[PDB]
């Protein structure tokens, strides 16, 4: 029994950045695996990957994830 | 028994990104696997992959994720 | 039984990016398998790819996700 | 037994991207798989695949997705 | 059992960062493993991942993780 | 019984960072692992990872991670 | 006063080259200038360029190069 | 007075070259200069500019160069 | 007074090269000046520039070079 | 007063080379100057100029240069 | 008065090599001034410049060199 | 008054190198100067400049070299 809820209710800078690089490789959420059973990946929020990765104001209201695996019984 | 809600209610800056590369190679979430059985991906919120990669307020409301993989019994 | 809902109700900036670059490889939400039974992918907010990747606002409502895999039973 | 349901009621930016680049390799959603069984593939949400991907406001109300797979019984 | 909840309810900075760099190689939530049963990879907060990379006011309401694994009986 | 919850309630700078470098390589939060059982990676917070890594204000808000694994009985 | 003579008097192999390239710029006998009054350029032998160059016996007999430049008296 | 002969008189291999490469610049018998007089190239013998430059047997005869510049009086 | 002369007179290997590389820059007989007078390139021999340069046998007979330069008076 | 003379007569190997490399800057014969009068260059010889430079019997007979430079009086 | 001679008169190895670098940078016969009058270079031998360079049995005749510079008188 | 001479006259190995490295920076005959007023080069014999630098019986017959520089009288 898997349940999940999530409720938001609204009533209602001079960020610099400069960047100067030569061969960039970025891996951000990379999961590697063999002979395995089972592979979940539940992504609710922020997932910024990059060589310039610039995130602002930005997982603000909520979030909510359940997850169950395996239960062999 | 998977169930999932989510409820949004409303009653109602000089970013600055340069950026200067060569020979990029960027993976967001990849996920790599051999001889399985399942492989489930939920995205609810923000996946953002680049070179550059910019995310202003992005996910702000009621997110809501529930996942269930296995249950031999 | 999987079952989901969302529901939004309503009663109602100098962003710059500069990108200058040379053989770019992107890879967002990969996934690779071999040998499996189940791949499932669902997307209920963004996913932005690119070599220049800007999302302004983007995921701001009542989202929900449910997902059941397997039951071998 | 699969359900979904959404409701939307509605009771009712200088952005600038300058991108110049060479030779742009980007894959947005690939799942790779050999010897499977089911492949699902949802989207309810923005899926925004370029050498420039720009997103503004995009995903904003009474999104649901809700999947089964397997069920071998 | 596995349940979650949240609940966020609203009744209403000369950053600068300079990177000069070359061969940049970051892997942010690397999980690599052989011969398992099971993975999961729950992200209900930011994962900011690069060569550089800036977050601002990011992860600001109501999270809520919930997972249960194994469970063999 | 995995139980979780949350409640966000809202009744309502002159940072430089300046790098110069060759030859980066960083691993954020690596779990490297052989003839495992099971691997859970919960993310409720930041996870920023670079070779500059600015963070400003990130996690302000009502978190809340629940797990189990295990459970053989 | 420029004189020049040549007399050539006639009383009568497994190379393998492999190339695998991209992107090659190449100058020869380039020769670049800026408020001159005299530019000369005599070739009386092998002048081979290419990106792959491959010379084989070339230049066998009797050359001769006579020059004279300026004499402002 | 510039004077010059030559006299070519006659009375009568596995090499292997493998090449593998990228993002070759090759400048040869570059001559950059700024606010001259003159500018004299004799070329007599073997010139071979490539990123694969392969020469065998090239310059076997006679070769003779005669050059005179300036000469204000 | 300049004079040259020459005179050849004819009374009649398993060499391996393997390169691979990436991102080469060769300048092979680069004379830079400024506000000069004169410049005199000769050249009676091989000149072999490459990234994979390979000269056999190349000069093997009867050079001769005779170069006069000023003579102001 | 510049004379040269040459004269030849005539009365008539497993080498290995491998290379693996990145980024290579090689400059062979330069001859950086300013505010000069007189610039003379003469080649009787080999150049060999690459990443990868070979030469095999190269300059094997009768090689003469005879130069003169000012000479004011 | 410069003078020169030569006279060659004919009557009649498991070298291995093996290079593995990175960011290699060389200079050979560099000769760097400012505020000179008289630059002379001559070159009758073998100059052989790399990352990898090999000679062999390259300089085997008869060299002769004869250079006179200045005399103001 | 400067003369040169030279006469050949003819009347007719498990080497092994390994190089591993990393960042390499060589000069050769550097000559590095400023307010001079000559300079003179000659290269009558072997020069071989690398990062591996192999010579094998290179300079092996008759050579001769004559300078005379300055004579202000």
Chains 1, 2, 3, 4, 5, 6, 7, 8, 9, 10, 11, 12 share one sequence.
Not at 25 to 32: D, I, Q
Not at 35 to 56: D, I, L, R, W, Y
Request: aromatic share 2%.
């Amino acid at each position: 029994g898997v349940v999940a809820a999530a409720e938001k209710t609204k009533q209602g800078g001079v960020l610099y950045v400069g960047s100067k690089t030569k061969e960039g490789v970025v891996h951000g959420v990379a999961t590697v695996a063999e002979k395995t059973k089972e592979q979940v990946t539940n992504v609710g929020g922020a997932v910024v990957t990059g060589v310039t990765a610039v995130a602002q104001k930005t997982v603000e209201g909520a979030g909510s994830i359940a997850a169950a695996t395996g239960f062999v019984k």
